[PDB]
Amino acid sequence: TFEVVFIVLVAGSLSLVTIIGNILVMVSIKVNRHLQTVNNYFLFSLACADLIIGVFSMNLYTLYTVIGYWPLGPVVCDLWLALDYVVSNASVMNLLIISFDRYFCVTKPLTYPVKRTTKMAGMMIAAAWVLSFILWAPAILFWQFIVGVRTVEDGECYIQFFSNAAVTFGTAIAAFYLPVIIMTVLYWHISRASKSRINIFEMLRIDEGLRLKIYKDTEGYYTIGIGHLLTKSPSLNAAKSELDKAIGRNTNGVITKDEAEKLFNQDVDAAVRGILRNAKLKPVYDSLDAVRRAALINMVFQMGETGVAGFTNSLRMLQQKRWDEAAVNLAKSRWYNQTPNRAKRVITTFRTGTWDAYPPPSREKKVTRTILAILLAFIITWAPYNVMVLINTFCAPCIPNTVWTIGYWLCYINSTINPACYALCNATFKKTFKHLLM
Ligand SMILES: O=C(O[C@H]1CN2CCC1CC2)C(O)(c1ccccc1)c1ccccc1
Ligand SMILES: OC[C@H]1O[C@@H](O)[C@H](O)[C@@H](O)[C@@H]1O
Ligand SMILES: [Cl-]
Ligand SMILES: [Cl-]
């Protein structure tokens, strides 16, 4: 009524925070090499979708609600709805992709992580957007022509086939409920698998540590990341050569926390490959389980496959599934005497077949930390609206208009609190933002 200016300021500010927030994320990733990871590519996609929501959906919806009707016409109305639903679907599918990524990472620690590249990412993102569009856009814009008549009037804006509540609910289930269910199930599996969370990566970063700067090994050779051997030369540049060959970029000698893990997975994959092509090592590797297979890989990491091959006697004891004796036998090596601590854990891993010899990081991954917040925010903000649809199926009068409006703004602001989560669950994003404002 007379209080219009207030609403406009609030909604305007909110839309402003959203747009500058996501653009800040997209830029933060583009301009900072440290933030350039496949996980952040997903967040980049999310930021795009959320940006569009801030510029278009929020603003136009505000206009539609403050003015009491739709002044902009049918064509712009149809584009607006398409855009909204297309990007919303893109968002939920991105959440799905992230979920599948976590599942494979957790379930296939050795094989999967190595094949996670920027290319696969961009393609999965591409499929997400394209597929979403294909589903919503055509139906939303052309439904009128399909049926031959337009049910939507000149002052109102809504999806035409949604005129029937049953169809709207059905669509909610397929578009929102099912993906949520699926995300629940596979995250249930992810939970089961990670209850006592240690993986070959955590293990090797404990034993060999994780250095982002070239450090001379006890043997005297050049090394990087998680015990990655470079060269034997006394000239640093001789190492910088091999390093820049593995990175594909001029590092000057220093790499990021992400390039370290990309190199790590490369070593792991290569490790396994060689073990399988190795006649002494293959049989025992075939017989061992995931945890004990990791322990073996650890040994190959430290002393090399030619060294590990020298443990034929103990290896045969492993294949016989005699764990305690295999341990006793392993401790008789000088390897045990020259690297007591690490050896004890690896041997113990062989002994028990569990990760119980290794202490958890005590601080969860940035990726898992972020993912959780994203999901919480998504479900808490979208559930109200969707359960509103459910209830609307049997009782329309129960849900007033003011309620629908609230539901809409919840779904909308979820695009606002995303960059907030990145900054809170990831110190690098926050830092980058801070420096980006200046
Ligand atoms: O949450 C939904 O709709 C919201 C998303 N957008 C546009 C309508 C509302 C508010 C913000 C959503 O569950 C939905 C809503 C109504 C009918 C069917 C599905 C949905 C829509 C598209 C893609 C994924 C989910
Ligand atoms: O097999 C594992 C080994 O593979 C090599 O490619 C790496 O340079 C080593 O650091 C790693 O320990
Ligand atoms: Cl890549
Ligand atoms: Cl981290």
Side-chain angles (χ1 to χ4, degrees), residues 1-196 198-212 214-215 217-218 220 223-437:
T1 58
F2 74 98
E3 54 188 356
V4 169
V5 63
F6 179 84
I7 298 184
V8 174
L9 291 171
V10 172
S13 302
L14 181 64
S15 180
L16 188 63
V17 173
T18 301
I19 52 190
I20 79 93
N22 287 276
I23 290 185
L24 222 53
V25 172
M26 292 164 66
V27 167
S28 284
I29 288 181
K30 227 70 168 61
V31 72
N32 185 9
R33 186 181 63 261
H34 282 252
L35 285 170
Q36 302 175 357
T37 67
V38 299
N39 317 270
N40 292 344
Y41 289 9
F42 292 152
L43 301 191
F44 191 96
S45 176
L46 241 57
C48 296
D50 293 337
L51 180 58
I52 293 184
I53 288 299
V55 46
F56 293 102
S57 292
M58 278 181 169
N59 293 328
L60 268 60
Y61 179 79
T62 288
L63 172 57
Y64 182 62
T65 54
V66 56
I67 217 174
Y69 73 105
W70 182 262
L72 291 179
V75 51
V76 65
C77 162
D78 298 327
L79 293 181
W80 179 54
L81 300 176
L83 186 53
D84 188 350
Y85 281 69
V86 163
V87 303
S88 290
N89 192 104
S91 299
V92 301
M93 281 196 182
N94 284 267
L95 291 176
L96 300 185
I97 296 178
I98 296 178
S99 297
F100 270 65
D101 186 42
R102 285 309 91 189
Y103 179 76
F104 291 138
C105 278
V106 172
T107 53
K108 309 298 174 184
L110 307 172
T111 53
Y112 176 73
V114 313
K115 52 184 179 178
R116 313 192 329 114
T117 69
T118 57
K119 184 176 184 179
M120 277 296 299
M123 169 163 45
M124 293 296 283
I125 302 173
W129 287 92
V130 173
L131 204 54
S132 302
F133 171 88
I134 295 177
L135 288 182
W136 290 107
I140 293 178
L141 284 55
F142 299 138
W143 182 265
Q144 52 183 331
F145 300 111
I146 298 173
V147 189
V149 54
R150 184 177 223 263
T151 303
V152 184
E153 295 301 336
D154 296 83
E156 51 185 13
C157 193
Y158 62 94
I159 294 182
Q160 186 168 164
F161 47 93
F162 278 1
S163 64
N164 183 12
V167 189
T168 303
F169 185 31
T171 298
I173 300 184
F176 180 81
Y177 285 99
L178 286 188
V180 166
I181 290 178
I182 284 187
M183 289 185 300
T184 286
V185 170
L186 65 78
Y187 268 102
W188 174 88
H189 273 85
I190 290 176
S191 175
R192 302 299 307 185
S194 303
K195 57 180 181 179
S196 185
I198 291 288
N199 58 27
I200 201 171
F201 169 78
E202 308 299 348
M203 159 183 282
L204 293 181
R205 85 165 301 175
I206 294 183
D207 292 324
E208 294 182 338
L210 186 150
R211 289 185 178 263
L212 304 185
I214 297 183
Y215 64 106
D217 176 37
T218 63
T223 304
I224 198 60
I226 300 191
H228 180 77
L229 192 58
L230 296 174
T231 192
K232 320 293 184 309
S233 174
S235 59
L236 279 54
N237 287 340
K240 306 187 190 305
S241 179
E242 239 299 338
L243 187 64
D244 289 335
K245 275 186 288 183
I247 305 297
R249 169 190 57 92
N250 290 329
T251 63
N252 297 7
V254 189
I255 66 174
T256 64
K257 200 167 182 176
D258 175 78
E259 302 177 352
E261 189 182 38
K262 194 174 181 64
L263 234 183
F264 174 77
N265 293 358
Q266 290 183 354
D267 302 325
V268 179
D269 182 85
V272 172
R273 302 180 78 89
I275 294 184
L276 295 179
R277 297 181 310 179
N278 189 280
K280 265 83 172 187
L281 307 176
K282 174 181 181 299
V284 68
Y285 184 76
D286 287 328
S287 68
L288 293 188
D289 50 88
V291 183
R292 295 198 174 92
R293 287 184 177 193
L296 183 67
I297 298 178
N298 189 322
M299 295 183 64
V300 173
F301 251 81
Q302 180 170 13
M303 63 201 60
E305 52 180 318
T306 75
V308 176
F311 290 84
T312 302
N313 291 334
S314 291
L315 297 187
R316 186 163 73 251
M317 307 196 66
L318 289 169
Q319 306 185 50
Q320 294 165 341
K321 301 279 157 286
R322 316 162 85 200
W323 316 115
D324 301 340
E325 308 180 8
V328 171
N329 199 242
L330 282 170
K332 297 183 192 302
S333 65
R334 41 182 163 184
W335 162 61
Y336 174 93
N337 301 267
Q338 297 179 355
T339 59
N341 292 330
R342 177 180 180 181
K344 293 172 184 175
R345 286 187 297 270
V346 174
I347 292 180
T348 297
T349 298
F350 279 140
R351 198 176 179 96
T352 70
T354 73
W355 299 104
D356 289 13
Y358 290 82
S362 299
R363 197 210 75 171
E364 304 177 15
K365 287 186 165 186
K366 293 188 180 303
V367 53
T368 68
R369 216 157 43 185
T370 293
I371 287 173
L372 183 58
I374 296 301
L375 288 179
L376 277 162
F378 169 73
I379 184 182
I380 184 188
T381 57
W382 288 52
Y385 183 95
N386 288 267
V387 66
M388 234 149 52
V389 171
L390 165 53
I391 295 182
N392 177 86
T393 208
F394 53 75
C395 178
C398 292
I399 316 296
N401 195 320
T402 296
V403 176
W404 286 107
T405 301
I406 300 181
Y408 259 88
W409 282 107
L410 288 183
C411 294
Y412 284 160
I413 67 164
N414 176 252
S415 297
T416 310
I417 58 183
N418 277 8
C421 294
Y422 306 165
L424 294 177
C425 298
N426 188 318
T428 308
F429 264 137
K430 170 179 259 290
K431 154 197 167 190
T432 311
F433 296 155
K434 172 185 178 181
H435 296 80
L436 272 178
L437 302 183

